[PDB]
C-alpha cells in the first residue's frame, strides 16, 4: 500500500482519487492519501472551489516512483512531482502517517469497481497517449484536445489517441467500399487490432482510458474516442468471441459508475441505440443492455 503525500492544501479544492471524491478546506491540515492498492494505475484529480473551470489531474502508478502533490501559487494548480530521495520521502511520510494527517483510500471495494474500470490500462500506454517524457506520471485536464480534433492546436498538450475515421482510406479498401463501410471487420481486425494495437488488450486499454478521462475531466475528445472504439466493434460482423464477452463486462462497469446526472452530456444517443439495437452485436452485450435499460431508459 503506497502513499501520495501533499505539501499542504493552500486553496480550497475537491480532490478525487479514482471514483472517490472529498472536500479540503483552504489551509486545512491535510497531507495526502495513504493505503493506495498497489498493482493498478490511479488518477488523482482536482476541482478548485473558486473556479470549477478546468478539472485537472494526474495518472500515476506508485510502482514507478515516489510521487507527491504541492500547490504552485504562480501557475495556480496542485502539481504532481517525483522525489528522488527515497530515504527522506519514507521518513517524511512516516511522520505524516504518525500524526494521522493523511486520509485513507477505502480498502473494501466488493464491486471491484476500480480493477474493472482499469483492467487493461497500463502506465506505459498512457504515457504514449500523453507525451511528457520527463515525468513518470501524466497530466490531463478538461480542455486538452485530441490529435484528431486538431486535424479538423498546440501539439505538446494533445491527447494522442489512435485516430478512427469510418470514412477514410484506412477504413475502406479500394474495391470493397460497400463491404467495408457496412461491415467494419477489416478495419477492426486487420488495420487496428493486428496492425496498430497488436492485441485486444491494448485496444481495450485505450478504450478504458478514454472513458475515464471523459468521466473525470469532462474531456469531450475523450468521449468521442470512447464511443468511436465501441462503435467500431459493434459495427463489425466478425469479432473474436472473447472480445465481445469482455467488452460487455467493460461497458457494464463504465455505465454502472457513470453519474446519473452526467448521462446527457457523456452518452451519445445515436451510438448507443445503434450498438444495442441495430448493430451486428445487438445481441452480444447482455449485461450492458440490462444496466442501460434499468439506469438510462430515457436515452433509448
Amino acid at each position: 500500500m503506497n502513499t501520495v503525500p501533499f505539501t499542504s492544501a493552500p486553496i480550497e479544492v475537491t480532490i478525487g482519487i479514482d471514483q472517490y471524491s472529498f472536500n479540503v478546506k483552504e489551509n486545512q491540515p491535510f497531507h495526502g492519501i495513504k493505503d493506495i492498492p498497489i498493482g493498478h494505475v490511479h488518477v488523482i484529480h482536482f476541482q478548485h472551489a473558486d473556479n470549477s473551470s478546468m478539472r485537472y489531474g494526474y495518472w500515476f502508478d506508485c510502482r514507478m516512483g515516489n510521487f507527491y502533490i504541492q500547490y504552485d501559487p504562480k501557475d495556480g494548480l496542485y502539481k504532481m512531482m517525483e522525489e528522488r530521495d527515497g530515504a527522506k520521502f519514507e521518513n517524511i511520510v512516516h511522520n505524516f502517517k504518525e500524526r494521522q494527517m493523511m486520509v485513507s483510500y477505502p480498502k473494501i471495494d466488493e464491486d471491484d469497481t476500480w480493477y474493472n474500470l482499469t483492467e487493461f490500462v497500463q502506465m506505459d500506454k498512457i504515457r504514449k497517449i500523453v507525451r511528457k517524457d520527463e515525468n513518470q506520471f501524466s497530466y490531463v485536464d478538461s480542455s486538452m484536445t485530441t490529435v484528431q480534433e486538431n486535424e479538423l492546436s498546440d501539439p505538446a498538450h494533445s491527447l494522442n489517441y489512435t485516430v478512427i475515421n469510418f470514412k477514410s482510406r484506412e477504413a475502406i479498401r479500394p474495391g470493397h467500399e460497400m463491404e467495408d463501410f457496412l461491415d467494419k471487420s477489416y478495419y477492426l481486425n486487420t488495420v487496428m487490432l493486428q496492425g496498430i494495437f497488436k492485441n485486444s488488450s491494448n485496444y481495450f486499454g485505450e478504450l478504458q482510458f478514454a472513458f475515464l478521462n471523459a468521466m473525470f475531466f469532462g474531456n469531450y475528445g475523450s468521449s468521442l474516442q470512447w464511443h468511436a472504439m465501441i462503435e467500431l466493434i459493434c459495427s463489425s460482423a466478425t469479432v473474436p468471441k472473447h472480445m465481445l464477452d469482455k467488452l460487455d463486462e467493460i461497458l457494464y462497469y463504465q455505465i454502472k459508475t457513470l453519474p446519473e446526472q452526467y448521462s446527457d452530456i457523456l452518452l451519445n444517443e445515436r451510438v448507443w441505440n445503434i450498438c444495442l439495437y441495430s448493430s451486428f452485436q445487438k445481441n452480444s452485450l447482455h449485461n450492458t443492455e440490462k444496466i442501460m435499460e434499468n439506469k438510462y431508459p430515457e436515452l433509448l
Binding site: 470514412k167 475502406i172 467500399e177 460497400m178
Partner: protein
C-alpha cells in the same frame, strides 16, 4: 452544404458540377406467384447524371443482370450508383472532372462519399430542391435505349437539344424541370401537349420537338396549366 432556392444560380456558374439521380436505377414489375404470393421481376434501369450548365447527360444503363444473385437490392443500388459515378469521374480528363456532385436523394451521400475518397477536393452535396428527374424515363428516346439494352452501356445525350443556341442555361434548366414536372404529374396529358401538332417534329438527333421561341411559350404555358390543374384535381381546389 445543401443546395436550395437561395443559392440556385450557382448551378449555372463556371464551376463544373453534376446532378446525380438514382431513382430509376432499381426498377421492377411486381406480380403474383402461382402459390398466390407476391414476387418482383427487375427491369432495366439507369443512372441520370446531368451537367445543368451544358445539358450533357451521362445515362448509365443498369442491366438487370447486375442484380442476379444479390440481396437487399435497394441498398445495393445506392452503392452501384456511387461505383458507376466514381468510375465516370475517373474516366474524364482532369479538366472535365466536376468540382461538386449534387445528389437528389440524401441516401446517396454516404455511398458516394466513400466511393470518392480518392477525390477529396470534389464536394458531395445534398439538395433541398424536389427535382423531377425520376420522370426521365417518360422521355421516349431515353426509355427506348434503356429497355432495349442487352448489356451495361453508357449513352451520352444533350438534354437541352440545341436550346442553348437561343437561351441561357438558367432558362434551359427551368424549361427542362417544367417539362419533367408535367410528365411526372400527368404523363398522358403532358405527352399530348408536346405532340398534338403533327407539323412539329423531333429531329433525329434531338429529344424534344423543334419548337420556335413563340411555340415554346405556348407549350410552357400549357405545361403550367397542366400542373396547376392536377394540383386542383388532387387537393380539390
Amino acid at each position: 452544404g445543401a443546395m436550395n432556392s437561395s443559392n440556385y444560380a450557382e448551378l449555372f456558374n463556371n464551376d463544373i458540377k453534376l446532378f446525380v439521380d438514382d431513382t430509376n436505377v432499381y426498377r421492377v414489375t411486381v406480380h403474383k406467384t402461382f402459390e398466390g404470393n407476391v414476387a418482383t421481376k427487375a427491369i432495366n434501369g439507369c443512372i441520370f447524371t446531368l451537367n445543368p450548365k451544358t445539358g450533357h447527360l451521362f445515362l448509365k444503363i443498369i442491366h438487370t443482370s447486375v442484380w442476379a444473385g444479390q440481396k437487399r437490392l435497394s441498398q445495393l443500388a445506392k452503392w452501384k450508383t456511387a461505383e458507376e459515378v466514381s468510375a465516370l469521374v475517373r474516366s474524364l480528363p482532369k479538366e472535365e472532372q466536376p468540382k461538386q456532385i449534387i445528389v437528389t436523394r440524401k441516401a446517396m451521400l454516404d455511398p458516394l462519399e466513400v466511393h470518392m475518397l480518392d477525390f477529396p477536393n470534389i464536394a458531395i452535396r445534398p439538395t433541398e430542391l424536389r427535382l423531377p428527374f425520376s420522370a426521365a424515363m417518360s422521355i421516349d428516346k431515353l426509355s427506348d435505349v434503356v429497355m432495349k439494352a442487352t448489356e451495361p452501356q453508357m449513352v451520352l445525350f444533350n438534354i437541352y437539344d440545341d436550346w442553348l443556341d437561343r437561351i441561357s442555361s438558367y432558362t434551359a434548366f427551368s424549361r427542362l424541370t417544367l417539362l419533367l414536372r408535367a410528365l411526372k404529374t400527368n404523363e398522358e396529358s403532358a405527352k399530348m401537349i408536346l405532340l398534338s401538332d403533327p407539323t412539329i417534329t423531333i429531329k433525329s438527333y434531338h429529344l424534344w420537338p423543334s419548337f420556335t421561341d413563340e411555340q415554346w411559350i405556348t407549350i410552357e404555358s400549357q405545361m403550367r396549366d397542366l400542373i396547376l390543374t392536377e394540383y386542383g384535381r388532387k387537393y380539390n381546389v
